[PDB]
C-alpha cells in the first residue's frame, strides 16, 4: 500500500457542522505512470455514511496530496473511520472524532520542553504531527512553571521572556505561547502541570505562610517536603483544605488561565502521605483532603471564564479502593480522571478490575492512566561493553548480575575509552543507556561521544555496592541510516569512575506496548504516552528520552490511535458498561481462552451498550500477565473457530470484527450461525485473523 504516504485531517477533533479537510498525500512508486481513482469511504460503526472520488494521475515517482471536504454530521460525541482505496496505487487510513468537548474522549498528550531556539514553525510542527497521526486532543504542558508556588516569572509587571525551571532549564515564554496557540489551532486543549500542594523553598517571602502547611508531627516541627538531593532544592507540602492555601494558589492557577492561555490545570500530587498533621497539631486524614480543594478550584475556574476551566488530578498509585482512589473518583468536581500506575496492578486483569471501578465511581467519566511501559527494563539492542574497543581498561568478571560474559572496570583515568561501533537501522533519534556499576561514594563522570564529536558529559550515580547495576545514564541523539561509532572517554575534568557493562539502543518493546494499550481500551481507558516530538514517555518526569520508539511502532500508535478514535463510541461512551453477570463464556477452538487475562491464553473481556454486546479479545499467546514489563511476538492466530454464549435474552442480527492489527482498523462483518446447547443460547463464527487485539461487536435489533 505504499504509494498512500499519509491519510490524515486538519484538527484533532471537530464541532458537529465544522468543515474537514481529509488529506491524502500520495506518490506513485510503481515505476511506471498511474492512472486512475483515489476512493474515500467514512463508517460510523458498521454504517457507512459517506463515500467519494477523485481521479488521479501520477508521473513515475511523482507525489501529491488531494483534498477530499465533509462536513461533520450533527450528531455530537461520534467517531468515524476513514478508508482511502487507491487501487494499484495502495490504500490508507485515519479517523475522526465529533465532538463538542476533549473531555468525553480526551486523547491526551504533553510538552515538556520549552527551548528558545525553538522557531514557531517547528512547535506548530511538533503539535500538527501528533494531532494528525494520533488525533490528540489535549496537551498536558509539563514543567513549564518558574516556580510550584509562582507560575510566571515576572519582574515588576512584566513578564520575564525566560526563566529556570527547578531542573535549571531554560523556559522560553514565546516558545510556550507558540505551543499554546498550535495546539488551538488543531482544536486542541492546553492544561497546565500544577501541584496540588506544592511550594518551593524559601516560601516566606512571597507571603505563604507554614501556617498553611501539612506537618510531619503534632508540634510543627517537620513540614512534610520532597528532597530533590542538592541541599537546596525543595517543594514543601500543605493543606488542601486550608482556605488559605486554596487562596493563594487558585490564584496562580487563574493567572496561568488568564496570563498564558491554559484551558485548565492538572493537578499534580506525590501520593500516599501517612501520619499528617496541620500545623497546629490536629491529626488529619490527607486522602479525603483533595475533593474539596478541586471542588472550589473547578468552581474558581468556571466563574473565571467556562470555556477554560478543564480539572483534572492525579491519582498517585492507582489500584482497586487504593489511596485517595474513592473519594477522589467518587467526590470530586473533575472533568476527567487520571491515575499514575505504580506496582499495585501489576497484571492486566489487576489493571482492568482498576479502570472498571474507576469508571464506575466516576459515573462513566473518562479515564486516563499514566503507565510508563518497559519502566524498569533495558530494552532495545544491546552492545556489551567487553565486545567493543577499549583503551587503558579491561574486562572482568569479579561483580555479579553482569550481563554477556563480564563487563569493563577500572574506568577511571584519563585516556580511558570505550568505543562501540553501533549500527542504526533507520534514520531518526537513538537513546544511548549505559548499564554501569559505581561505588565510589560520588557522581562519576565520562565524555560522550559519538562519531568523533563531544556530544555531552554524562553523570553515573553512586550505588551502595559494586554489584548494584543501574541503566539510568543515557542521552539522545539523532543518527543517519547506518554505522556509527558511540564513545566514552575519561577526559580532563571527569572524576570517579565506573565498571561499564554495555550500551543499549533504548527502545519500547512494541509487543508489550501493543497489548498494554489494548487491554487499556477495552477496559475503557486511554493512556497518556506521547508527546513532544513524536516521543513516547519512558518515565515520570517527561523530558526524560531514555527510550524511543522505532518506525515500526510508530506505525501501530497511528493505528491503534485511529482504532481508539474512530470506534470511541464503541469503548469509551457512558453506554459503555462490563457485561459481567450470567456465568458469560467464550470458547476458542485449538487455544486455551480465559477470562481474567491469564498467562498464554486469548483473553475475553465482556462489555455492552444498550445496542451492542461486544467482545474483546487480547492475545496473550506465548507471554506472561504483566501489563508493563517487556514481551515476545504474540503466537498470532488464523481462521479461529470462535463461540460466544450469550443470555437468552439476546438475539443477534450482526457479527462485527474490527482490530488495529488487521487493514488499518476497517470493520469487516462475519457470517454467524446461532445454536442452543448445554452451555445455554450462542452464536459461533471463525475469526479469520487475531495477532494483538480484535474488537468483536454484534448487533442487537
Ligand atoms: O509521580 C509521583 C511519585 O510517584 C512514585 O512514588 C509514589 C510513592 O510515593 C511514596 O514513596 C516513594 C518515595 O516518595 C518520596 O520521595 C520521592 C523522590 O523524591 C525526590 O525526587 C522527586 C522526583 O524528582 C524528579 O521528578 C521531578 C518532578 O517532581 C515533581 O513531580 C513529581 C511527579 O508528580 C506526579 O504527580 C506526576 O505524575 C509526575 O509526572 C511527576 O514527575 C514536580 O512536581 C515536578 O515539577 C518535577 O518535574 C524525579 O525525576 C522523580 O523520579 C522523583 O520522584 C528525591 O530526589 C528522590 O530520591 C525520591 O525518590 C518520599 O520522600 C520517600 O520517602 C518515598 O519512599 C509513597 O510512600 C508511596 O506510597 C507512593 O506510591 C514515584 O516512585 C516517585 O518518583 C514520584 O515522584
Ligand atoms: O577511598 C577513597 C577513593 O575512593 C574512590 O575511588 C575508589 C576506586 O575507584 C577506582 O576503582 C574502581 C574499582 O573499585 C573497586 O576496586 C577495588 C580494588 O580492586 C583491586 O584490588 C584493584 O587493584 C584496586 O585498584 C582497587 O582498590 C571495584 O571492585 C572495581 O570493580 C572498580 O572498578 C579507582 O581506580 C581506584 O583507585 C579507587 O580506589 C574515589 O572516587 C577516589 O577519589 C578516592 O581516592
Ligand atoms: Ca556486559
Ligand atoms: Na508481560
Given at each position: 500500500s505504499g504509494g498512500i504516504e499519509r491519510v490524515f485531517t486538519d484538527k484533532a477533533r471537530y464541532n458537529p457542522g465544522d468543515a474537514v479537510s481529509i488529506r491524502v498525500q500520495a506518490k506513485n512508486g510503481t515505476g511506471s505512470s498511474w492512472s486512475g481513482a483515489a476512493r474515500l469511504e467514512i463508517f460510523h460503526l458498521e454504517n457507512s455514511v459517506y463515500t467519494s472520488s477523485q481521479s488521479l494521475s501520477l508521473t513515475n515517482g511523482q507525489s501529491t496530496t488531494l483534498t477530499f471536504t465533509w462536513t461533520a454530521p450533527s450528531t455530537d460525541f461520534r467517531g468515524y473511520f476513514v478508508r482511502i482505496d487507491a487501487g494499484t496505487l495502495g490504500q490508507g487510513a485515519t479517523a475522526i472524532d465529533v465532538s463538542?468537548?476533549?473531555?468525553?474522549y480526551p486523547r491526551y498528550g504533553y510538552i515538556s520542553e520549552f527551548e528558545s531556539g525553538e522557531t514557531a514553525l517547528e512547535s506548530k510542527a511538533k503539535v500538527d504531527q501528533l494531532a494528525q497521526d494520533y488525533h490528540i486532543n489535549a496537551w498536558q504542558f509539563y514543567?513549564?512553571?518558574?516556580?510550584?508556588?509562582?507560575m510566571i516569572k515576572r519582574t515588576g509587571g512584566s513578564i520575564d521572556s525566560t526563566w529556570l525551571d527547578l531542573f535549571n532549564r531554560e523556559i522560553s515564554w514565546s516558545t510556550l505561547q507558540n505551543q499554546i496557540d498550535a495546539v488551538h489551532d488543531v482544536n486542541g486543549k492546553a492544561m497546565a502541570y500544577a501541584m496540588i500542594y506544592a511550594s518551593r523553598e524559601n516560601?516566606?517571602?512571597?507571603?505563604?505562610?507554614?501556617?498553611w502547611g501539612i506537618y510531619?508531627?503534632?508540634?510543627?516541627?517537620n513540614q512534610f517536603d520532597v528532597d530533590f538531593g542538592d541541599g537546596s532544592t525543595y517543594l514543601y507540602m500543605f493543606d488542601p483544605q486550608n482556605p488559605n492555601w486554596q487562596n493563594y494558589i487558585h490564584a496562580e492557577y487563574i493567572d496561568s488561565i488568564n496570563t498564558?492561555?491554559?484551558?485548565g490545570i492538572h493537578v499534580a500530587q506525590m501520593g500516599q502521605r501517612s501520619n499528617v498533621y496541620d500545623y497546629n497539631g490536629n491529626s488529619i486524614?490527607?486522602?479525603?483532603?483533595?475533593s474539596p480543594f478541586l471542588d472550589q478550584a473547578k468552581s474558581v475556574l468556571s466563574a473565571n471564564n467556562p470555556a477554560r476551566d478543564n480539572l483534572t488530578y492525579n491519582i498517585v498509585?492507582?489500584?482497586?479502593?487504593?489511596?485517595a482512589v474513592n473519594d477522589v473518583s467518587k467526590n470530586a468536581d473533575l472533568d476527567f480522571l487520571y491515575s499514575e500506575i505504580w506496582y499495585?496492578?501489576?497484571?492486566y486483569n489487576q489493571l482492568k478490575n482498576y479502570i472498571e471501578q474507576l469508571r464506575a465511581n466516576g459515573g462513566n467519566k473518562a479515564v486516563v492512566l499514566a503507565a510508563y511501559m518497559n519502566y524498569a527494563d533495558n530494552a532495545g539492542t544491546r552492545y556489551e561493553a567487553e565486545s567493543a574497543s577499549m583503551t587503558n581498561v579491561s574486562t572482568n568478571?569479579?561483580?555479579?548480575?553482569?550481563?554477556?560474559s563480564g563487563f569493563v572496570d577500572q574506568?577511571?583515568?584519563?585516556?580511558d575509552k570505550v568505543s562501540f561501533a553501533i549500527n542504526?537501522?533507520?534514520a531518526g533519534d537513538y537513546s544511548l543507556v549505559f548499564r554501569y556499576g559505581n561505588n565510589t561514594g560520588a557522581n562519576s563522570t565520562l565524555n560522550l561521544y559519538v562519531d568523533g564529536n563531544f556530544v555531552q558529559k554524562l553523570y553515573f550515580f553512586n550505588q551502595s555496592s559494586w554489584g548494584t547495576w543501574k541503566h539510568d545514564a543515557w542521552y539522545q541523539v539523532p543518527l543517519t541510516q547506518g554505522a556509527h561509532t558511540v564513545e566514552l572517554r575519561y577526559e580532563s575534568g571527569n572524576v570517579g569512575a565506573v565498571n561499564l557493562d554495555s550500551l543499549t539502543?533504548?527502545?519500547?518493546?512494541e509487543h508489550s506496548v501493543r497489548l498494554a494499550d489494548a487491554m487499556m481500551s477495552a477496559s475503557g481507558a486511554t493512556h497518556i504516552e506521547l508527546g513532544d516530538d513524536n516521543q513516547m514517555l519512558p518515565?515520570?518526569?517527561?523530558?526524560?528520552?531514555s527510550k524511543t520508539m522505532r518506525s515500526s511502532l510508530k506505525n501501530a500508535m497511528k493505528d491503534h490511535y485511529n482504532f481508539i478514535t474512530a470506534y470511541e463510541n464503541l469503548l469509551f461512551?457512558?453506554?459503555?458498561?462490563?457485561?459481567?453477570?450470567?456465568s458469560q463464556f467464550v470458547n476458542l477452538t485449538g487455544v486455551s481462552a480465559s477470562?481474567?487475562?491469564?498467562?498464554?491464553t486469548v483473553w475475553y473481556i465482556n462489555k455492552r451498550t444498550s445496542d451492542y454486546n461486544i467482545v474483546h479479545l487480547i492475545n496473550?499467546?506465548?507471554?506472561?500477565?504483566?501489563?508493563?514489563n517487556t514481551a515476545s511476538q504474540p503466537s498470532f492466530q488464523t481462521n479461529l473457530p470462535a463461540k460466544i454464549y450469550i443470555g437468552a435474552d439476546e438475539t443477534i442480527s450482526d457479527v462485527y470484527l474490527a482490530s488495529?492489527?488487521?487493514?488499518?482498523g476497517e470493520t469487516q462483518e462475519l457470517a454467524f450461525t446461532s445454536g442452543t446447547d448445554a452451555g445455554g443460547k450462542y452464536v459461533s463464527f471463525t475469526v479469520p485473523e487475531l495477532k494483538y487485539w480484535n474488537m468483536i461487536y454484534m448487533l442487537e435489533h
Open positions: 463538542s468537548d476533549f473531555t468525553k514543567d513549564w512553571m518558574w516556580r510550584h508556588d509562582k516560601y516566606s517571602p512571597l507571603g505563604i505562610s507554614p501556617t510531619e508531627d503534632s508540634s510543627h516541627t498564558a492561555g491554559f484551558d486524614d490527607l486522602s479525603t483532603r483533595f498509585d492507582g489500584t482497586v479502593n487504593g489511596w499495585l496492578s501489576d497484571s568478571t569479579n561483580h555479579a548480575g553482569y550481563t554477556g574506568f577511571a583515568s584519563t585516556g542504526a537501522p533507520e539502543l533504548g527502545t519500547f518493546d518515565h515520570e518526569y517527561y523530558p526524560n528520552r461512551d457512558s453506554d459503555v458498561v462490563p457485561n459481567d453477570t450470567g477470562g481474567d487475562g491469564s498467562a498464554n496473550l499467546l506465548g507471554n506472561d500477565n504483566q501489563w508493563r488495529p492489527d488487521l487493514s488499518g
